[PDB]
Each structure stands twice: as C-alpha cells, then as structure tokens.
Amino acid sequence: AEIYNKDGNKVDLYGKAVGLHYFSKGNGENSYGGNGDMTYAALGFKGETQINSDLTGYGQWEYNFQGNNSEGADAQTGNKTALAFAGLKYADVGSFDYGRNYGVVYDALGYTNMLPQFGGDTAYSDDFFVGAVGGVATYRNSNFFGLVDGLNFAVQYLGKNERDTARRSNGDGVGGSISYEYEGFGIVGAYGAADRTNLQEAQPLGNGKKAEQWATGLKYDANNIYLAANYGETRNATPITNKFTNTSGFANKTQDVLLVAQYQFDFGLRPSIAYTKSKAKDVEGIGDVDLVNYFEVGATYYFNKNMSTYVDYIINQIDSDNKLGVGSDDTVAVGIVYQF
Amino acid sequence: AEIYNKDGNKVDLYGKAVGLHYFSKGNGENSYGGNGDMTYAALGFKGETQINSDLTGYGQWEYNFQGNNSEGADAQTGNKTALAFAGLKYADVGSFDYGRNYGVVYDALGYTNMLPQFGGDTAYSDDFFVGAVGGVATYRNSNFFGLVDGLNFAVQYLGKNERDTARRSNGDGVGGSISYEYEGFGIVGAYGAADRTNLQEAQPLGNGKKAEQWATGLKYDANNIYLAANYGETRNATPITNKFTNTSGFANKTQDVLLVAQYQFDFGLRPSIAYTKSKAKDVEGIGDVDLVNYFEVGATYYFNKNMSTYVDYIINQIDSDNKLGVGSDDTVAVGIVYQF
Amino acid sequence: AEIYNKDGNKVDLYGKAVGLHYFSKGNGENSYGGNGDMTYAALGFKGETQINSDLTGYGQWEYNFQGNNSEGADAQTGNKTALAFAGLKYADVGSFDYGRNYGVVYDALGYTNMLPQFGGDTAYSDDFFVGAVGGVATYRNSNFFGLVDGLNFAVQYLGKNERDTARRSNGDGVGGSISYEYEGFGIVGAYGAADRTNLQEAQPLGNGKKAEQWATGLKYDANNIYLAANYGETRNATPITNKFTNTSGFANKTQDVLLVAQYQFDFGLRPSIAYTKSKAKDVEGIGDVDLVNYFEVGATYYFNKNMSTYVDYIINQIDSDNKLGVGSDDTVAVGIVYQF
C-alpha cells in the first residue's frame, strides 16, 4: 500500500496474513503438500525515486514470517528474507539491479506459477536461476531499447555462493531470457548455466561441473482467460532426495512440463485447472523416476483486492512405489488471505 | 497508527519500544521475574477492508523483537510472531478467523491480564486455549446475532500441533466462551478440552489423554475504576518443571485465582494492586505445591497514548523450600514505553 | 520517511535495500573485508510525541536483515535488532533513554565512522561503550542546560550482561562524553570503564578486572568539507582472536588512530580518503601486533537523498606474517543503495 509519496520518492509498504491449512492423511510423511497449519504472513517495502525525467532508483525488500511455529525453539522455522535488491532504470536503456532476486529462468517459469497455493514446483529457491537466489546482477530491457514494442530481454550474472549446504550453494554462472508479447499472447525463452561448487560435486546424487536450467513459456492472457504452458529441462540442477537410502544431491537431468488454465469471472470467482510433471532421468541407482506428477483443481474467490479465499486441490499421480520416496497422497489446502 | 485508509481498505501499522529492567538479587536463579535488561520492541499491522455494507475482511500480524540480545549467536532469543491470522465478519452473523491467535480461554483470563508488566501468569503461550497458539479456527458472535445487546459467545477449533517439544505441542481440541456485559459489569465463562500428543503423554509429569482448561471472569470497569477477578482450573494443561530432578511435563491439576484493582486518575497515574495464586495438585512425587503466589503493587504513568512509564513490584509469597524449585524472591520491573 | 504526524505524535518509518559485493582473492580467509555478496536491508521506526511544550517522549527500533543468506538453515545469519530504546526529553534539562543504543564512546568514534562502507573499525558491537550495546541508561545534555551554546555532555550506565559468550558479555560500568562545537569545528572526549565478567576473565587472551575505553575526536565540517581525526586507547576491551592457536579474548591494551578526509561536490560526488591503525600491545604470547592497518580511497555518488552508489577501496597494510592471523589482502566493495 502506498504510504509515502512526496518530493519524487514513493514507498509502498505491503504485506498479508494468510490463514492456511493443508488436509492430507497419515503421519504426514506420504502426501504432496503435508498436513496441518501452514499459516504465514509477509512484509516488505517497494520504493522508487524519480532521480530525474529519465532516471529512476528503486529498492525492494520482502520477508516471510511463518505463522505456524510456536514461540519456543522452532520460532524461526521457515522465516527468511525473500527479496533484497536495489537498482537504477534509465529511459529505454535498461535497468540494472543487484541483490537477492528472482533468477532469469523464472522469467519463463512465472507463466505457470499462478495457482491458488500450489504449482510452480520447479521454481526452487536458492537453486541457480529458477527461483529466488542471492548475489545476482540482473540487466533487463523493455521493448528493445524502445524500438520494438513488446520485445524484452534480460541477462543475469550469478556470483558464487559457497554455503554450508550443497542444496543452497552455487558457483559463478550466466543466464538470460528473451520474450515477446502481442495482444494477450506471450512467448518466453530462458536459459542459465553455472559452475557447481566442490560440495555439490561431493554429493552422491549428480555428476557434472556445470548446472544447466532452461524453460520455454507460452501464454494467452486477456478476455478474463489465462492459459499457460512451460517446457523445460535441467542438468545437475534440480535438488533431489532418496528417502530410502537417505542420500542427497541433484538429478542428472530433468524434463519438466506445466500447464495451467484459469478463468476470472467478474463476480470474483477464478476456477483453476492445472497439470504438472517433472521427471528425473539417469538418477544413480534408480534411472528414470518421477519427482512431480499431478492434476490440480481449485478456485480463488476475490472479495476485492485486499481479501480473498481459496481451495487448492492436488490430485497426486506419483505412485506409492516411487523409487525416491516422493509422496503419493493428495493434498487439499484451504486459505483466507488479507493483503495490502 | 493508521497509515493508510483509501478505497475501502485501512491499515494500522503499530508498535513500540520498551526500555525495561528487572531488579532482583543473586545469580538470578531464585526470583519471580529475573534480573537485568528486559528491553523489547514490537511491530505489527492490523488491516481491514470494507468488502460491502455488511462484509468486512481483516488480517493481523504482530512480531516480538527482544532488545536484550547481542548481535551474536543469541540474536533471535525470545523473538517470534505473536499473532498471524485473517478472517471475515458479516453483519450480525459473526466473524471467523484462522491462524495464530488467542485461545478462547483467554476471553476469560484477559480480565486480570492488565498489570503494568507482570500478571496474567496462567495465560501461557502455545498452551492449548489460554494464550497465543497456532492453528486455531475461531468463530465469534456479538450481541447474540444482534438480538441481545451485550451478550457474546465464541467457539474455537484447535488443530493438532505435533511439534518437537511436549511443552509447545497440542492435539485436536474444541473450546468456547460465553460472556455478558451490562453497565461496566461483565461476566465470562470459558472452557476448552483437547487431546494430548504422544510426546506429551511420554513426559514424567502428567497423566491423561486430554488436556482441560477453564476460567470464570467477573469485572467492574467504569468511572475510572477497574476491578477484576478470575477463577480457573486446569487438568494436564499447565506446563511445570521440577528444578531439582530436572524432569518436565504438565501438572495433573491446577486451581488458579487472580484478583486486580486499579484506578485511573485524570492526571495520568494508574495505581495497581493485585493478588495471584496458582496451585498444582497431585504432582507425581510432590502432591500439592504452589506454582505462583504473590501480591502486586505498581503504577503506570501515562504522559499520553504514545508515552508512558511504570514500576511493577512483585511481593513474592512462594516459599524458599517450594517443592518444584519455583523462585521465592521479589522482582521490581521499571520501564519506559513509546508506542504508536 | 514520515508516514504519520497527527495529534502530537509523529512516526518515521525508514529503511533501505543495499546491493553490495566485496571483491578480494583466495578462499576468502586472508582479506580485509571478505569476498562475495554482502547485500543487506534494514527496517526501523523513529517515533516522537509532543507530551507538552517542554516534554517529548521518543522511541526507536531498527533491525538488520542480511540479504546474502539462503532460505535454508543459514537464514538468520547476521540478523539482529540494531537499536531498541525509549526515553523522555525535557526542555533544556536533558534527555534520558534506556535500551539497546550506542555506547558513549561512540560519541567520539562517530567523527570518523563516515566511510562509504568500511571504516569505524574500533566501534565494535556489544563491546562496552564503543558501539551498540544492550542495557544502557543514557543521560544527555545539550548546550549546558541551555546556558552554553554548542557545549554538550553525556553520562551512561552500562548494566551487566552475563551472556553465553565472553565476546558479547559485559559487567556494570559507567561512561561519559563531553563535546564542543563552534563554526564547523568540533572536539569530543569520551571515556568508559566497566567490570569484566567471570567468563571474560577465564579467556586466555587478557588480564584485568576492568575494561577501559577512551577516544578523543576533532573535526571540521562545513563548506562541503569534512575532515576528522580520532585518537583512542583501550585496556582489556578490544576483542581479538589468535587464528593460529585458535584462542580468544581481549587485547591487554590497544592504541587506535583514525583519519578521514572527504569532499562533497554539489553534483553529488563525494570522494573519500582515510587512514586507520589499531595496535594491540602486550598480547600474551605475541607482544605488539597490528589489528588494523590500512589506507582507504573511495567515493559515493548521491543521485538524491534516496538513491546512491559507491565504491570503497581498502589498501591493506597488515603484513602477511601478522602474528594474530589478521588478513593482509585488499578489499573493494561496490554497492547500490535505495533508502527511505
């Protein structure tokens, strides 16, 4: 919500409180999304200052506060800064920002990351270029320097992150994206490649000096309709876990597809239908095994732009015998959202 | 403080910085409240949107930031999200919210949780229905569907929380409260019952498949006067610790009383007097032992609604030989509060 | 940014998002500042209420959110409440605040803590009186009770902090500062002394029952010019580490000098030049060894008061053989800052 706008600077302080509950069965160890309270809140700011006619400075920070932890030792579980970056935008020359931001491959993957609560299964956090990462320098360009309406492109430099965990680490890498939009239709292409760290190479699942991620996106978004599809493959980039052996690392290769269809009624209801499949190929010890496989049905009800409610239902197709231990049961999430 | 109010939505961004210091004696191990710096700050938002004439959506989030930790490894000690919930309110039909909120038994216990800094000793956090918990669905009704002025009621569903700690866990449970207010007087009744988790049952202090908490409240609140009393009992619900053996769990039963008397002078001073006693009955190995036993004297000085100061003095009656190790010394807290 | 100002109370909600990257060489273990992403954000509030003509209440809270952590187990690394205090100010009688605030010796040390990113090397956090600490009661006076324009003074009471770490602990102590300003020139003197805790005494580096810190400050600050110098010594107060033996504690004595020269061009550029040297004397096992020794060059470019950019270059003079293991390589930081 815009709380300050004077002398060229504007600050938007935003957030939400989401009451959220997942319904599955068992001890919780075999479903898609889990079971019980999943409440969470968020707080951030988005600032922008008009340096002059052509030049804008901007900054953004966003934090995730789980609401399903006790005030005891588990108090900070799942809490983190989602975004933290600052940059400059100059006329039609471009923008440049640095800090913790969305990887370039998310430029494609965002087409299908539109479900009520689930979806966007391959846009992992701290995973090279597909989700939020730390230490990325991103150059972005709109309308090809103002010459070609609807034609955008970006390049992104991923600096190495030698963390304690293989899962959360990354070496130096370059990525990019190109897209074109015209009358509701849009097409994107995005690719990234980075070195893996020693620690990543030491894990038992995954062989290669470089991680690679790419995705394609197609969509139709107008007339209250939203149809989207993404196609992508990864090499040594998708984090995987063998639940049986309890080993860990990255899948040698993944083939991933996401499909989404939604309709926005003027009365506020927005039914959603989706299909998601992610398959790991050549997993040492396993070979081909599905990571993600489901059908999705759900709806959001928008009271207005501050209040909404939803039900998100995952018809899980992963089988009970799945070679990696990936859950096979269904999950139904139900949530009430206030946002500003 | 209301920082945004446009197009039906309103956001109140609030908080405070409390400079706070507790004065007791020793190595700190035998007083009521402890010793040294107890500074802390808080930040939250309270949002509300007018969906239409009869329908309101709302959301609230509040965080506690201790101010007595170093910037070292103890940085997050005592930090947590106090509240995180969202809901809807419809005409005189009721309200419904879900997330981390106050348990229904706090509807009674809030009558006496009005001291300058201490008090409200049996409104434990993450303890079924007496304080803040995660995963509660609360229905609330004002004035009996608009038919009986001053007659309110609530029902609350506690979903299971199988955490790592017995202290912070809970099984499924139902609770409720009924109250009546007329001309400064008010009477409340609140009860809750939930299953205990396996981990709770495994502890050495406490036997039972269900936790039970109830409290009654009576008050007079008008003419600058505030008198309140609460009477309550718990079964397998009050967290207790044997300091000598170093065992832990919940008291088989508790009998608890709280009494409060305060006066609000027009010049800003508000003297406070209180009595609090909590007794555990049938503690395995001990039998009857007091958990809480003291007299309270204090005053708050209100410069206005943003600035205030106080002194809170606990005359501790727990004896030096207390069977559980509960401190016997006095505590004096002194604080200066800025809030917005 | 001032987001609320009504009925005597005013709230300033402030913050920034800083994209920041340090460039050094190696595995990172031998430079001045380190290597890689150093992004971080900040959020705080500064409130003030006009109680009456002569009396003001105030409160402040500030948090540091690192932006170079993953959303994994290292999520809270470096996160903390920087400041949390409240107080009262009465006419020309003085101000008094309590909570986590800057130690009095920082009244002197702030003269040279003005570099783009580095500098202020002896204003350690949680280190008696030179940086931010918890549990300090500070009385401050401006213009000698309104009698002597430009003549200020302060006294500060440090309450004991018996933490888990020797580094972050402190005993009871008193400190003070006096300063005088006239036409761009300013001179400060500040001293503090506190008891050390048992844990501090138990460490292998440092002998003494009391910690002592003092600094002198001189500056010229007008005509777009800023020249400053600080001279100070510590006794058993500067935290030190022997990287070779892996021991820890405080230097018996330190001698510290800081020099800064900057120029603020009207077009927005502010070149900076600085010199910093800190020497430890009589370190058990070592004798005299430099802790800090470098030359600094840098510039900040101010687009306006919300956006800025900088380069900060440390020409490190510590030698490769430094007896304590203190890094000898150079560091270049580069950052883009949005603030409000």
PDB file of N, CA, C and O in Angstrom, chain C residues 213-239:
ATOM      1  N   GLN C 213      37.815   2.089  27.922  1.00  0.00           N
ATOM      2  CA  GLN C 213      37.841   2.564  26.544  1.00  0.00           C
ATOM      3  C   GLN C 213      37.775   4.094  26.548  1.00  0.00           C
ATOM      4  O   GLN C 213      36.944   4.645  27.263  1.00  0.00           O
ATOM      5  N   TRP C 214      38.611   4.749  25.761  1.00  0.00           N
ATOM      6  CA  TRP C 214      38.536   6.191  25.613  1.00  0.00           C
ATOM      7  C   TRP C 214      38.972   6.617  24.212  1.00  0.00           C
ATOM      8  O   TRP C 214      39.798   5.994  23.562  1.00  0.00           O
ATOM      9  N   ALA C 215      38.407   7.753  23.818  1.00  0.00           N
ATOM     10  CA  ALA C 215      38.697   8.302  22.496  1.00  0.00           C
ATOM     11  C   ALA C 215      38.534   9.815  22.531  1.00  0.00           C
ATOM     12  O   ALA C 215      37.746  10.380  23.287  1.00  0.00           O
ATOM     13  N   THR C 216      39.280  10.461  21.661  1.00  0.00           N
ATOM     14  CA  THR C 216      39.239  11.917  21.501  1.00  0.00           C
ATOM     15  C   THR C 216      38.824  12.155  20.056  1.00  0.00           C
ATOM     16  O   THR C 216      39.103  11.282  19.234  1.00  0.00           O
ATOM     17  N   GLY C 217      38.163  13.268  19.775  1.00  0.00           N
ATOM     18  CA  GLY C 217      37.742  13.493  18.389  1.00  0.00           C
ATOM     19  C   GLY C 217      37.920  14.959  18.032  1.00  0.00           C
ATOM     20  O   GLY C 217      37.742  15.844  18.865  1.00  0.00           O
ATOM     21  N   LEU C 218      38.324  15.205  16.799  1.00  0.00           N
ATOM     22  CA  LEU C 218      38.472  16.576  16.313  1.00  0.00           C
ATOM     23  C   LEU C 218      37.931  16.582  14.880  1.00  0.00           C
ATOM     24  O   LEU C 218      38.136  15.615  14.149  1.00  0.00           O
ATOM     25  N   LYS C 219      37.235  17.648  14.509  1.00  0.00           N
ATOM     26  CA  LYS C 219      36.686  17.711  13.170  1.00  0.00           C
ATOM     27  C   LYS C 219      36.392  19.139  12.719  1.00  0.00           C
ATOM     28  O   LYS C 219      36.249  20.089  13.474  1.00  0.00           O
ATOM     29  N   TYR C 220      36.307  19.223  11.402  1.00  0.00           N
ATOM     30  CA  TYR C 220      35.993  20.418  10.652  1.00  0.00           C
ATOM     31  C   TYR C 220      34.922  19.928   9.671  1.00  0.00           C
ATOM     32  O   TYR C 220      35.156  18.916   9.001  1.00  0.00           O
ATOM     33  N   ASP C 221      33.762  20.565   9.722  1.00  0.00           N
ATOM     34  CA  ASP C 221      32.607  20.077   8.965  1.00  0.00           C
ATOM     35  C   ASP C 221      31.718  21.210   8.496  1.00  0.00           C
ATOM     36  O   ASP C 221      30.706  21.533   9.123  1.00  0.00           O
ATOM     37  N   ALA C 222      32.083  21.820   7.379  1.00  0.00           N
ATOM     38  CA  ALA C 222      31.378  22.943   6.784  1.00  0.00           C
ATOM     39  C   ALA C 222      32.033  23.257   5.437  1.00  0.00           C
ATOM     40  O   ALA C 222      33.115  22.748   5.157  1.00  0.00           O
ATOM     41  N   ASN C 223      31.407  24.064   4.599  1.00  0.00           N
ATOM     42  CA  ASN C 223      31.905  24.391   3.273  1.00  0.00           C
ATOM     43  C   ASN C 223      32.117  23.176   2.397  1.00  0.00           C
ATOM     44  O   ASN C 223      33.174  23.044   1.767  1.00  0.00           O
ATOM     45  N   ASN C 224      31.233  22.192   2.448  1.00  0.00           N
ATOM     46  CA  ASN C 224      31.288  20.945   1.718  1.00  0.00           C
ATOM     47  C   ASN C 224      32.497  20.079   2.046  1.00  0.00           C
ATOM     48  O   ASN C 224      32.777  19.092   1.375  1.00  0.00           O
ATOM     49  N   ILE C 225      33.236  20.415   3.074  1.00  0.00           N
ATOM     50  CA  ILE C 225      34.424  19.733   3.529  1.00  0.00           C
ATOM     51  C   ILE C 225      34.133  18.940   4.791  1.00  0.00           C
ATOM     52  O   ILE C 225      33.320  19.356   5.613  1.00  0.00           O
ATOM     53  N   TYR C 226      34.797  17.812   4.972  1.00  0.00           N
ATOM     54  CA  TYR C 226      34.676  17.016   6.177  1.00  0.00           C
ATOM     55  C   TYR C 226      36.036  16.403   6.511  1.00  0.00           C
ATOM     56  O   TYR C 226      36.486  15.496   5.810  1.00  0.00           O
ATOM     57  N   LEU C 227      36.691  16.898   7.544  1.00  0.00           N
ATOM     58  CA  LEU C 227      37.977  16.355   7.963  1.00  0.00           C
ATOM     59  C   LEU C 227      37.821  15.879   9.408  1.00  0.00           C
ATOM     60  O   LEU C 227      37.294  16.664  10.202  1.00  0.00           O
ATOM     61  N   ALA C 228      38.224  14.657   9.728  1.00  0.00           N
ATOM     62  CA  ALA C 228      38.072  14.220  11.108  1.00  0.00           C
ATOM     63  C   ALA C 228      39.233  13.334  11.547  1.00  0.00           C
ATOM     64  O   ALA C 228      39.881  12.675  10.728  1.00  0.00           O
ATOM     65  N   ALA C 229      39.456  13.358  12.859  1.00  0.00           N
ATOM     66  CA  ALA C 229      40.521  12.533  13.421  1.00  0.00           C
ATOM     67  C   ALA C 229      40.065  12.035  14.790  1.00  0.00           C
ATOM     68  O   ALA C 229      39.330  12.747  15.465  1.00  0.00           O
ATOM     69  N   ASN C 230      40.402  10.805  15.136  1.00  0.00           N
ATOM     70  CA  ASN C 230      40.099  10.230  16.429  1.00  0.00           C
ATOM     71  C   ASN C 230      41.365   9.608  17.025  1.00  0.00           C
ATOM     72  O   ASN C 230      42.128   8.970  16.294  1.00  0.00           O
ATOM     73  N   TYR C 231      41.553   9.755  18.323  1.00  0.00           N
ATOM     74  CA  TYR C 231      42.698   9.092  18.945  1.00  0.00           C
ATOM     75  C   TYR C 231      42.146   8.364  20.179  1.00  0.00           C
ATOM     76  O   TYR C 231      41.451   8.987  20.975  1.00  0.00           O
ATOM     77  N   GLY C 232      42.493   7.094  20.323  1.00  0.00           N
ATOM     78  CA  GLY C 232      41.970   6.343  21.447  1.00  0.00           C
ATOM     79  C   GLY C 232      42.792   5.144  21.855  1.00  0.00           C
ATOM     80  O   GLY C 232      43.661   4.614  21.168  1.00  0.00           O
ATOM     81  N   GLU C 233      42.559   4.748  23.106  1.00  0.00           N
ATOM     82  CA  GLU C 233      43.232   3.605  23.705  1.00  0.00           C
ATOM     83  C   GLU C 233      42.185   2.787  24.451  1.00  0.00           C
ATOM     84  O   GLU C 233      41.143   3.325  24.815  1.00  0.00           O
ATOM     85  N   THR C 234      42.397   1.487  24.495  1.00  0.00           N
ATOM     86  CA  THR C 234      41.548   0.574  25.225  1.00  0.00           C
ATOM     87  C   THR C 234      42.452  -0.288  26.115  1.00  0.00           C
ATOM     88  O   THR C 234      43.605  -0.539  25.774  1.00  0.00           O
ATOM     89  N   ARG C 235      41.882  -0.756  27.208  1.00  0.00           N
ATOM     90  CA  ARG C 235      42.518  -1.705  28.098  1.00  0.00           C
ATOM     91  C   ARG C 235      41.548  -2.874  28.260  1.00  0.00           C
ATOM     92  O   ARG C 235      40.350  -2.671  28.501  1.00  0.00           O
ATOM     93  N   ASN C 236      41.970  -4.092  27.953  1.00  0.00           N
ATOM     94  CA  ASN C 236      41.148  -5.278  28.100  1.00  0.00           C
ATOM     95  C   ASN C 236      39.747  -5.116  27.521  1.00  0.00           C
ATOM     96  O   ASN C 236      38.809  -5.718  28.056  1.00  0.00           O
ATOM     97  N   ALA C 237      39.589  -4.456  26.390  1.00  0.00           N
ATOM     98  CA  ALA C 237      38.289  -4.130  25.839  1.00  0.00           C
ATOM     99  C   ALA C 237      38.134  -4.505  24.377  1.00  0.00           C
ATOM    100  O   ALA C 237      37.029  -4.820  23.938  1.00  0.00           O
ATOM    101  N   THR C 238      39.194  -4.512  23.591  1.00  0.00           N
ATOM    102  CA  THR C 238      39.104  -4.884  22.181  1.00  0.00           C
ATOM    103  C   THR C 238      39.130  -6.398  22.019  1.00  0.00           C
ATOM    104  O   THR C 238      40.066  -7.062  22.456  1.00  0.00           O
ATOM    105  N   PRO C 239      38.081  -6.955  21.434  1.00  0.00           N
ATOM    106  CA  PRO C 239      38.023  -8.383  21.161  1.00  0.00           C
ATOM    107  C   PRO C 239      39.087  -8.754  20.143  1.00  0.00           C
ATOM    108  O   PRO C 239      39.308  -8.016  19.179  1.00  0.00           O
TER     109      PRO C 239
END
